[model samples]
Target: SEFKVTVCFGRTRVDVPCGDGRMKVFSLIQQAVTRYRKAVAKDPNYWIQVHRLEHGDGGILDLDDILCDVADDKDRLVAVFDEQD
Candidate 1:
């Protein structure tokens, strides 16, 4: 089970439970984005510029097309991808 937290209004973060459901990745992302946008409306500061999608610009993202998740004191997370046979 993958865990995901979302940022809510008033600088509050909420947890989203997503089990092994048969939902497309794109659908999941869109759902998350919906929640984020609403949160931002409540508090503009709660929104963040996240690289949710790569637009026509050479791998550059836009401001409105970004989605934010709930996180409390979010720390830097890194993932190293390596191709192996």
Candidate 2:
């Protein structure tokens, strides 16, 4: 294909894959969130704060919505965690 595909990740590498290639992107993010929830849950009455990364040029769709707190169901349509990675 000789196509150039450059995947960019932040310092935390939160945007990268941490699991086997078999799992979908949405599943991966949820796994991370679930793990984080577990880590915090182990603590004394702790809740993990999910952080959403901001994409410079991309609109609402480009960014991950796993942690997004959109009120409307319409927004929720694009905010599904399982549908995406």
Candidate 3:
């Protein structure tokens, strides 16, 4: 089974296909960032790093957490972006 999650970053949102709940949150972050990059402008200084995933209620989803354990299908997730100096 696949869980479709809506990941939002700024004004861009992408539906990431997460296969099974066994996948780690880090993997989902990678997928969301990868897909989000395609829709946004490319910047050398401003790179996108999915620091963490936040649910609708502002709950932090850790990188080590399981996808299915914390999220459900069609859930809205906000991608917290990190800054590089």
Among all candidates shown, the one with the greatest TM-score: 3
Count clashing residue pairs per candidate: 4, 3, 0
lDDT of 1: 0.35
User: Which pairs clash inside model 3?
Assistant: none
Q: Candidate 1, which ten residues in sequence have the lowest lDDT sum?
A: 76-85
RMSD of each: 13.6, 11.8, 2.6
Candidate 3 stretches with Cα past 4 Å from truth are 41-46, 83-85
- Comparing 2 with 3 on TM-score, the higher-scoring candidate is 3
Q: lDDT score, residue 40, model 2?
A: 35
Top candidate, metric lDDT:
3
TM-scores, each model vs. reference: 0.32, 0.29, 0.79
- Residues 6-49 of candidate 1 have per-residue lDDT tens digits of 32322333334445333343444445455655644543444343
- What is candidate 3's local distance difference test score? 0.76
What would the per-residue lDDT of candidate 2 be over residues 19-41, giving only the tens digit for each residue? 22343334534554554434433
- Write down the lDDT of every candidate, Cα atoms only: 0.35, 0.32, 0.76
Worst 10 residues of 2 by lDDT: 1-10
